[PDB]
Amino acid sequence: EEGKLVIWINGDKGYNGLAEVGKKFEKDTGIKVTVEHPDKLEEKFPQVAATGDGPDIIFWAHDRFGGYAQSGLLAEITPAAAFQDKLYPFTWDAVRYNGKLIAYPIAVEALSLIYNKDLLPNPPKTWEEIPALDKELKAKGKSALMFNLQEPYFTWPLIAADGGYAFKYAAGKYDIKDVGVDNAGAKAGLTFLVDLIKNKHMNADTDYSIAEAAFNKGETAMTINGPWAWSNIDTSAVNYGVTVLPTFKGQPSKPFVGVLSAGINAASPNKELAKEFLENYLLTDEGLEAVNKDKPLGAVALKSYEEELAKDPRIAATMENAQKGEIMPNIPQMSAFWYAVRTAVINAASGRQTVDAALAAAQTNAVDSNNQAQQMAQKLDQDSIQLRNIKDNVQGTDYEKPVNEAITSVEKLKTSLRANSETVYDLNSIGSRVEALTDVIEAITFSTQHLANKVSQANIDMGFGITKLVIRILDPFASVDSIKAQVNDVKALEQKVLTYPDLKPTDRATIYTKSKLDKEIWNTRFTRDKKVLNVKEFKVYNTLNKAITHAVGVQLNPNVTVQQVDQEIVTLQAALQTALK
């Protein structure tokens, strides 16, 4: 509406300097400006500006905004010369798309490496120096490095140093057939990172808040972030540097440089009131100090303030980083690229995939599969291909009902983004639900390969605990945290069970230990039909067929002890060998 103001910015930037300028605005001109910080605000801005609803001005790195021209969601913009001289013209170049300048350059972000000067005389300017410093600090009681291992923005400098790239620019355009994510020095960086978590130099589970927690409480020796994050380190009491990132393979690290930009809503009649706040009270000195006292913007586009905070050696080494990197593309195919790359670092540092197999899926997805949605549908199809697979395998078991509900769940989520769009489920939770399905699968996998040699209550608990997970996975009531906490219980349950007494060779043998004699029966009939059936003469077929009927009799018995089964399998793999003359 015309009276109130709403701005969408990210809850890691100076939103609490953007409220301030709101009150240096209401208390001046009779227009209140109360400022929001939605979650996922870059991926809801599509599905709500297609309904004529959105904040009055949207703030993000310039790389999404250009998809907001391929659906018209942003409005054209035009200031005067005494103002396009007031900022730097290369940031005007970031928001330009098809001539039509479609947003306001506020400031220029860049990931810069942050260390501890109390711990470290001088940081390792080369990335290979660092594993030799974690195994040193793996004695002092501290770590070496943590940063967000969950959004690909943070890994992309390493990947890019030896020559990973998003899209090759070629005499005017980016070539959307020439993606550089599965190239050679891509694989170098990704592989190099894998090892460090692997050698417990980092942890594959580190996210934003945990790494911001870690470096500031001061356990780990280093971190990496934008300038929005010095705020909470200014706020805590760690003595740092802010340096160039290390050089992996003698080449610098190359961060994707973001321009924090301010578009303007598509269907907005507030377009007049928008381009007033943004120039007079924010994009100035008085305004930029308030947003920068809160969460530093690094290098502010505004020549008058950039030249002030330029003496700041943290910003002079933010720039040193942002010139060794590359201003991102704003083309709409970026989104599809990021998510494609997001999946691979998740899937590598974890282990679900090898560095090469990841990057090749990531490349294919980037060159064509430009649907943020169709990528998820793929991951689920793989799960159900494997869920359906693990079903026939492990069934009649304590795990049938967790399996079959997950299968139903892998199919419920899939429509929720396709032709259904009813979505009993909230949007923030989609990705969390789907990644949790990977966590369900790995628990069905853990439980079938390590618990089957125990008392059935070990297998009872996990059986129930995986069903609890698929339930929260399917509950519209469960929020993103309600799920993650449930996912860490199923991981917590896997330790609890291993405490239980292993089965005892006199005990009534559990289905699982009868699941082992049954696999020998299937192996022996398959080997028998293949290498005996016509092959050797029937007198010896008969006196193997009996050892099957006998070995079946042992697992139709309910009162069979473990020991009575163990020695029955020895029979077959000495009676199938007896029938190998």
Ligand X SMILES: OC[C@H]1O[C@H](O[C@H]2[C@H](O)[C@@H](O)[C@@H](O)O[C@@H]2CO)[C@H](O)[C@@H](O)[C@@H]1O
| Strand-strand pairing, 104-109 and 256-262 | antiparallel
| CA-based end-to-end distance of the chain | 90
Min. distance of Cβ 481 from ligand X in angstroms? 19
Identify which of 443, 535, 549, 542 has the alpha carbon closest to the alpha carbon of residue 497.
443
* 258 forms part of the interface with ligand X (CB under 6 A): yes
User: Which member of 9, 64, 231, 469 binds ligand X (CB under 6 A)?
Assistant: 64
The H or E element that residue 257 is part of is: strand 256-262
Rounded to whole angstroms, the Cα distance separating 497 from 454 reads 9
Stretch of 50-58, 61-69, 96-104, 530-538 lying at the interface with ligand X (CB under 6 A): 61-69
User: Which member of 97, 192, 338, 425 binds ligand X (CB under 6 A)?
Assistant: 338
Total site size for ligand X, rule CB under 6 A: 12
* Structure token pair of residue 193: 């990172």
Rounded to whole angstroms, the Cα distance separating 63 from 67 reads 8
Instruction: Output the CA torsion sign for 24, 28, 29, 31.
Output: positive
Stretch of 56-64, 172-180, 277-285, 360-368 lying at the interface with ligand X (CB under 6 A): 56-64
Min. distance of Cβ 253 from ligand X in angstroms? 15
The contacts of residue 324 (CB under 8 Å, 6+ apart) are 244, 252, 253, 254, 255
Stretch of 57-65, 271-279, 414-422, 456-464 lying at the interface with ligand X (CB under 6 A): 57-65
User: Which member of 17, 67, 152, 164 binds ligand X (CB under 6 A)?
Assistant: 152
Min. distance of Cβ 472 from ligand X in angstroms? 26
C-beta closer to ligand X: residue 341 or 576: 341
* 214 forms part of the interface with ligand X (CB under 6 A): no
Stretch of 150-158, 191-199, 484-492, 526-534 lying at the interface with ligand X (CB under 6 A): 150-158
Could you say which residues in the range 101-140 bind ligand X, by CB under 6 A?
Answer: 109
Degrees (nearest 5) of the Cα angle 385, 389, 391?
A: 125
Could you say which residues in the range 1-40 bind ligand X, by CB under 6 A?
Answer: 10, 12
* 45 forms part of the interface with ligand X (CB under 6 A): no
Stretch of 46-54, 151-159, 481-489, 546-554 lying at the interface with ligand X (CB under 6 A): 151-159
Residue type, 479: S
Min. distance of Cβ 480 from ligand X in angstroms? 16
Residue type, 231: S
Three-class secondary structure of residue 122 per DSSP: coil
User: Which member of 56, 63, 405, 520 binds ligand X (CB under 6 A)?
Assistant: 63
C-beta closer to ligand X: residue 64 or 514: 64
User: 525 near 470, Cβ under 8 Å?
Assistant: no
Residue type, 108: V
> In DSSP terms, which residues pair with 180 in a beta bridge?
165
> What's the half-sphere exposure (Cβ side, CA atoms, 13 Å) at 479?
2
User: 455 near 503, Cβ under 8 Å?
Assistant: yes
DSSP secondary structure string, 308-351? TTTS-TTTHHHHHHHHHSEE---STHHHHHHHHHHHHHHHHHHS
C-beta closer to ligand X: residue 10 or 378: 10
Measure CA 385 to chain center.
22
C-beta closer to ligand X: residue 151 or 507: 151
Rounded to whole angstroms, the Cα distance separating 570 from 563 reads 11
> In DSSP terms, which residues pair with 108 in a beta bridge?
259, 299
Could you say which residues in the range 371-430 bind ligand X, by CB under 6 A?
Answer: none
C-beta closer to ligand X: residue 338 or 425: 338
User: Which member of 36, 151, 368, 507 binds ligand X (CB under 6 A)?
Assistant: 151
User: Which member of 9, 58, 61, 101 binds ligand X (CB under 6 A)?
Assistant: 61
> What's the half-sphere exposure (Cβ side, CA atoms, 13 Å) at 376?
20
Min. distance of Cβ 226 from ligand X in angstroms? 6
Rounded to whole angstroms, the Cα distance separating 40 from 26 reads 28
C-beta closer to ligand X: residue 349 or 569: 349
Min. distance of Cβ 339 from ligand X in angstroms? 7
User: Which member of 147, 153, 230, 277 binds ligand X (CB under 6 A)?
Assistant: 153
Min. distance of Cβ 313 from ligand X in angstroms? 22
C-beta closer to ligand X: residue 106 or 144: 106
C-beta closer to ligand X: residue 109 or 398: 109
Three-class secondary structure of residue 187 per DSSP: helix
C-beta closer to ligand X: residue 37 or 142: 37
Min. distance of Cβ 228 from ligand X in angstroms? 7
Interface positions with ligand X (CB under 6 A): 10, 12, 61, 63-64, 109, 151-153, 258, 338, 342
